[PDB]
Amino acid sequence: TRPTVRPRNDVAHKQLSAFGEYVAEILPKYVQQVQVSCFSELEICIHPDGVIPVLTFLRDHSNAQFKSLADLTAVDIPTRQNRFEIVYNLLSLRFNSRIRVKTYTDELTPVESSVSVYKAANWYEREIWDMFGVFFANHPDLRRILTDYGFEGHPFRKDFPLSGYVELRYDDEVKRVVAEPVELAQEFRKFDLNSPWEAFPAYRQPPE
Amino acid sequence: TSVKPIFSRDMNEAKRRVRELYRAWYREVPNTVHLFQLDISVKQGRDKVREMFKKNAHVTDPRVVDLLVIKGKMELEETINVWKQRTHVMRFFHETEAPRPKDFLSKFYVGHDP
Amino acid sequence: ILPGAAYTEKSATYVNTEGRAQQTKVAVMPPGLAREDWKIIRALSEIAGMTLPYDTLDQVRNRLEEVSPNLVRYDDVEGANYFQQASELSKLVNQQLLADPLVPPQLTIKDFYMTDSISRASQTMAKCVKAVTE
Amino acid sequence: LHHAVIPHGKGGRSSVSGIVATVFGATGFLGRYLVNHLGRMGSQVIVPYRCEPYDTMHLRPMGDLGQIIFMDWNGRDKDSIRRAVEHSNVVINLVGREWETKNFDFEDVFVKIPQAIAQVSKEAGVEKFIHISHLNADIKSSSKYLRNKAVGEKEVRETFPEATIIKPADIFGREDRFLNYFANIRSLGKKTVKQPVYIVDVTKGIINAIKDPDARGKTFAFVGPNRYLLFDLVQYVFAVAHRPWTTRDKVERIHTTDRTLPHLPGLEDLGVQATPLELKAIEVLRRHRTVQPAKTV
Amino acid sequence: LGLREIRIHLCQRSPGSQGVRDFIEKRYVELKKANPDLPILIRECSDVQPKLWARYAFGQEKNVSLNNFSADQVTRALENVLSSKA
Amino acid sequence: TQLITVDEKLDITTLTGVPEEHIKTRKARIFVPARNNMQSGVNNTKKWKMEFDTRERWENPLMGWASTADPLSNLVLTFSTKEDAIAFAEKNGWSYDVEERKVPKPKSKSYGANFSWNKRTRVSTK
Amino acid sequence: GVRTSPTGEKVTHTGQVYDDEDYRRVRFVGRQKEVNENFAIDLIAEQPVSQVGSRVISCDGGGGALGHPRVYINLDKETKTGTCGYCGLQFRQQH
């Protein structure tokens, strides 16, 4: 399997597994799962009451020093009752490593804002509000950041359509750009591309 | 059924926040009609505020009306500070849209929508 | 003439030969000014001043449940008892058999392809009939 | 009814209204808002234009792709009128001038060109023709405008007997020459009574006359809700505008009172709420700014 | 003016429909002999409560609950229907 | 405490920003999608889908393209179970109807049945 | 091989022409309906049937990797030629 297969990094896999054990036993109040991927990335899956303790630990601990918030992300998964998956990508410059911190909420439970831990998060979780509707409690200036000013709904939710609900045009009668319900001259043609045959037997979910 | 609140522990605090948000909009409407130089009257914009508040008058969950007050404060903040333009404020008044058929028979005449 | 929807053009309850109620779904919309059928009858009742107490399809199906509640229980065969009582009612008026033999109307594959208005309008069924006759 | 002209959609920009309109005189004040309100339904609008194509640019954002067809035309050319009307199912006539020029006088603008358009639309099988007269059009009028426009009304009726003739009184809007005339005149007060009508009311009425089959052969009188005296109307215009090119025919028409014809239908027989001047006068006259409302009769 | 059709709904297995089932097992045959041109639509279903629909002239439909009745109460309600024509 | 007691049905229709036309007049269909009979693979029949009623698709006057006015005409969701799908439809105020999952019944396969002594299940060829 | 409707409008190789009463002819008024006059069904009919002596021939449209995928055409039917599914060139077994 030499030329075309990605070579596995066993050293970093073992190191990130040991550090995941370390984080799981220092913070067992909040840590739910710890998993290391096959391409050597460490995910810490936490309870959302420990956003500030887990991130402050990873920022300030002498064996962590994850001083850099790379990215902050929600993922909408509608089949879960806590459908929003808040992902924290942290970067350690001292130990040259990355860690993923993941937690959950639904549409109504707020997540505690992490601008006291990372000032990078100020626009990121504001974008998560704008795109998903995840309210972040005790945020300095939480409002929209990317959508238009009168915009209704949260576009990156998966029950939100691709073209939205309203579209704009200029109207010469009222001398004003107006919002009218969306009508496409050509509908977005949905392609059912999924193959009816299983591709990855290692990822097979067990039957009921 | 034990959920973490947003701002209001129950519906009375929630209605307090709805009431203060309505007070803030009612004070703001003359300023909005003036500085955006809208072609509406102050009574007409206040009727639109009352329409938007009576639209959500069925909600019995404190967290949902906490989020409704939060989004109403965000709309208010975009309207007091001139972040919206005149077009965003007039998008509440669906003026270029044709009046939709209401009863069964006119909806039958124009098309297939129920 | 009142242009109606076809079975691919309306969500619509059909019951098969065994009592299983089933609903179609709207694949496409009817062509031109053609409308759904109960919409036409309900609009006719509103014009005539004898308005039918339903507006949406769900209310038509509430009426349909009021007339027999197994028309809204979809993909369900409801069993029917009381063969004995129908047999006792069938012995009342003694009807006589005609001497004509039992001949079904569809004897060969020729008579299969065109039975209703959609099959008779089909050029593919016309090719089928022409191909099975030659 | 042909299959491509059956209406579809929810009545929006990409929908199909089934209205294929040729609007003569579409580059003007009324044609602007008529092509606006047609193209937002999804109508195939045909714009014969006399002018520079730069002056028809504002009509292109008014409908979906391929829904406004521009073409050259001449008022004395029946070939261009035929080339414009032979595919339409409604022809709206909006050709007019406040002033007569070297080539086109009031008779050519109001009599020759309207009767030519109506006759060519008649022989091209166009079902509907909608002609715009003036409310004060009279054979015995003192202005040459209203005499030629009454004669043209007569000829359009007797060459297209199913046409919908419409009598606007004095249309006010942003691009009018009624309130913008008074805001710039900075003529005198007389015994004149007027009831001006808003341009969106006139446009909604023309479209409701397109759609209603009961408007064929009728004559409508589009008037506002409130009759005003001329003098306090002009003082209300100067009061809204925060203020302390003419000819004698325009003076003859300003000092000609709006006749009341209750035997003719109006905007309410087309289902249009007449908008009063007090709501839209600020919208017209906000541009002229560097108020007790007007007294009705 | 007069009665047009009678609809009887019932479950096949519920104890609330026991009186309706015991009505249809015994008295329906002489009911239909007594009413030769009256449609009496017995419509069994899976979980319904028993019900006596009676349609009169001009689309007027009265609705009678037959839940937990005996066969005698079903006979009395149905003969009230046949005697009313209201 | 810092946990309140909400005894109400979870309804977020005011928060999703969807217009009332596309909330109260739409019918969700909750179903396991049927196997494409062009193929023997069954991997597309594992998850619950939510689609909506198909509204009008008309012809573009210019190009002949398929114009639409339905925003939810391409919206297909994916659920692990039926109950997650029903909870999502009730949470968003969508009227729904649910088809139960259709599994193929177990078959009794015998290659020896093709060559029987006294049964009709002999194959005439192979 | 373009032909013309009685309205004067050209007909494409699909067979598309607008009707006499269809309003959408107004888009060509003062302009032109652009058709291509090289009809492919007429041009491939002008190519002669290739006489070959094998029972199975192959075709890739000429040019190697510049043509189409290489397909193998049976020629057992003596009544009908064997036609390529991609390029439309047709073949006949000479015996």
Ligand SMILES: NC(=O)C1=CN([C@@H]2O[C@H](COP(=O)(O)OP(=O)(O)OC[C@H]3O[C@@H](n4cnc5c(N)ncnc54)[C@H](OP(=O)(O)O)[C@@H]3O)[C@@H](O)[C@H]2O)C=CC1
């Ligand atoms: N307040 C009002 O304006 C009222 C108007 N009316 C009538 O309504 C109609 C439309 O009014 P309105 O829009 O305001 O007037 P405009 O002068 O603004 O528009 C007239 C239109 O006709 C065209 N036109 C004018 N003269 C000629 C000509 N000789 N040959 C070809 N085209 C010509 C103009 O195009 P181009 O730019 O190419 O010249 C323009 O598109 C007129 O008939 C008018 O009499 C009635 C009552 C009140």
Ligand SMILES: [Zn+2]
């Ligand atoms: Zn080839």
